């Protein structure tokens, strides 16, 4: 059952798609990349490692464009094609550089009666166990790397199908494992291959007891950094929006700190709000700056703000809110649908333009439960699946 692919294998790939893909990379990452590539697989160049150094050094010393070096890589050093390990390294640097282009989707791990289970994934064991299970079904080549700035482990999985005399590659599948969290991030794809990969991952983790994977949400998240704050292990996972200051915990100092600069002793100046409805009937620049600051606190949680200034901590693309209430001994419901880039950020400026009243802003509309489309019932928010 040697269906796994070694590092020396050269899968078939179109030279045109890889031609434009390498153009997106800067010269500095295309320089050192080929140097490690020659140190592992060699090349068709008539020289050793040292000769390939000054020849490539001359190109970067001349400030030459990105096009010619890509042509040299594709048609001179490796004219036949690119290896499977070689292809995986390219996507590794693209993930680190620009993470906005790649989708993500959460998944919760449950076992037994439903208690959440924290994953204790190990790199060495997971590589062979996943390969062994998928060897009998398809050709599998798994390569995982640790995120440089985050504790999340990113796993790259590809499936190969036979045909062009040899086989060809398919679309990749990405699975992200947080360091310590019961939630698994994975790329969204509705394919028969995608279902097999996710199911096989559940089995190899369930060596102790049976574990099921359930999709928490339907709408994907644009960035890995954004999805790490909302659902990964962090202090901002639950408290957000108006409660963002609690996660930062900057307002309260240590009990052993000096008492001279205490908030209670110093005090603060705030605007007296009027509970009488004068918004429908509709200046001091000292009162105007308070009006802008009142909207500043409600949508971000702090007067200074935590990261122009209208952007939120994490953008949300789609939210669906259903509000239910009982009037005249019967249920009255209304459905609100939103769409945009930063829905909660966009709602902030509408208060700045005095289009909507800031006092009568519900907590869910303010920005609480970011990216959680749910139904509000009797003043409480319930997750909708």
């Amino acid at each position: 059952n040697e269906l796994r692919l070694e590092d020396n294998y050269v899968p078939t790939s179109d030279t045109l798609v890889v031609f434009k893909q390498l153009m997106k990379l800067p010269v500095t990452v295309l320089y050192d990349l080929t140097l490690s590539w020659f140190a592992k697989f060699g090349g068709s160049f008539d020289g050793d490692i040292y000769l390939l150094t000054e020849t490539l050094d001359l190109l970067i010393e001349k400030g030459v464009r990105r096009n010619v070096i890509v042509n040299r890589i594709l048609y001179v050093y490796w004219p036949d094609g690119l290896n499977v390990f070689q292809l995986a390294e390219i996507d590794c640097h693209l993930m680190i550089s620009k993470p906005e282009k790649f989708k993500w989707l959460p998944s919760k791990a449950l076992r037994g009666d439903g208690k959440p289970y924290v994953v204790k994934l190990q790199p060495a064991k997971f590589i062979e166990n996943l390969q062994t299970d998928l060897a009998k079904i398809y050709h599998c080549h798994v390569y995982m790397f640790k995120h440089p700035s985050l504790p999340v482990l990113i796993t790259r999985i590809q499936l190969f199908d036979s045909n062009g005399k040899p086989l060809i590659s398919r679309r990749p599948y990405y699975v992200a494992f947080p360091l310590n969290s019961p939630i698994i991030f994975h790329s969204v794809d509705k394919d028969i291959y995608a279902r097999l990969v996710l199911q096989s991952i559940s089995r190899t983790i369930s060596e102790r007891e049976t574990i099921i994977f359930k999709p928490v949400q339907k709408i994907p998240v644009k960035s890995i950094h954004n999805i790490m704050t909302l659902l990964g292990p962090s202090r901002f996972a639950e408290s957000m929006g108006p409660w963002e200051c609690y996660a930062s915990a900057n307002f309260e100092r240590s009990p052993l700190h000096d008492y001279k600069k205490h908030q209670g002793l110093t005090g603060k100046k705030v605007m007296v709000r009027e509970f009488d409805d004068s918004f429908l009937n509709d200046e001091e620049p000292e009162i105007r700056r308070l009006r802008l600051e009142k909207n500043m606190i409600k949508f971000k949680g702090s007067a200074n703000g935590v990261m122009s200034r209208y952007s939120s901590l994490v953008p949300i693309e789609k939210v669906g809110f259903t509000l239910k209430n009982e009037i005249n001994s019967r249920i009255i419901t209304i459905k609100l649908k939103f769409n945009g880039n930063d829905i909660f950020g966009g709602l902030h400026e509408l208060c700045d333009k005095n289009l909507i009243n800031i006092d009568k802003v519900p907590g869910w509309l303010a920005g609480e439960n970011g990216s959680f489309s749910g139904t509000i019932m009797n003043g409480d928010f319930q997750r909708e699946q």
Partner: protein, 241 residues
């Protein structure tokens, strides 16, 4: 789906002046309709201010050709500033030939019709209300939804919608009580009552009823056979100063 193009009149004109001389330029027969009815602004009583005169005719011979069908519906007053307006549907040469003929006849000049939030919502009130042959007013309800398109930088919030099931519409008007303007006292305040957004201040794109009408500021779209009378009257007051 029939799209209606709206249009106003500068000063009151007479249209039945020369139906014989409106045809030879067009080379086919056009009929005439003379009609006036009561439009009760208040159910208790009505003054002489609702005295309305309406004209209607068409330009066609072929009933099979439903696509090439157009109607010119006139209605208006004679005592306020703007006497009347007009509306038409469909695209054809017949939608303008008469229009030039009274371009150079009476000296009235036209202008596109402008709608904003103060008017757009109240049109659905006249659309949903019904009148029977016994002068009894009952309301046929529809699940209205609203379209909002706020202008913003970064396109952070470019379009959002509010949908109301109209059984919940039923539960709102009954709570307020018997009202002749359901969207004054059951619907529009309730959106501000719960979510705190002012519908009128926000830029509104469309108000959609459940399979009856299609209201947008640029043009009104309705799947009915012909437009009603309360709709035209409320349009007239709205465009009045």
């Amino acid at each position: 789906p029939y799209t209606w193009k709206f249009l106003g009149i500068s000063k009151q004109l007479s249209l039945e002046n020369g139906i014989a001389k409106l045809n030879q330029l067009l080379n086919l027969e056009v009929d005439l309709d003379i009609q006036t009815i009561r439009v009760p602004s208040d159910p208790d009583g009505g003054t002489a201010a609702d005295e309305y005169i309406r004209y209607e005719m068409r330009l066609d011979i072929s009933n099979l050709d439903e696509g090439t069908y157009s109607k010119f519906i006139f209605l208006g007053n004679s005592k306020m500033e703007v006497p009347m307006f007009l509306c038409y549907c469909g695209t054809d040469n017949r939608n303008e030939v008469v229009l030039q003929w009274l371009k150079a006849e009476y000296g009235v000049i036209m202008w596109p019709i402008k709608f904003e939030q103060k008017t757009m919502i109240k049109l659905a009130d006249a659309s949903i209300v019904h009148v029977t042959k016994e002068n009894i007013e009952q309301i046929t309800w529809f699940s209205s939804k609203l379209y909002f398109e706020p202008e913003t930088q970064d396109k952070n919030l470019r379009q959002f919608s509010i949908e109301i099931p109209r059984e919940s519409c039923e539960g709102l008007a009954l709570g307020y009580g018997n009202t002749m303007h359901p969207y004054n006292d059951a619907i529009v305040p309730y959106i501000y009552n719960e979510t705190g957004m002012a519908v009128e201040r926000l830029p509104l794109t469309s108000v959609i009823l459940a399979g009856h009408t299609k209201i947008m500021r640029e043009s009104i779209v309705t799947s009915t056979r012909s437009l009603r009378n309360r709709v035209l009257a409320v349009v007239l007051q709205s465009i009045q100063f």
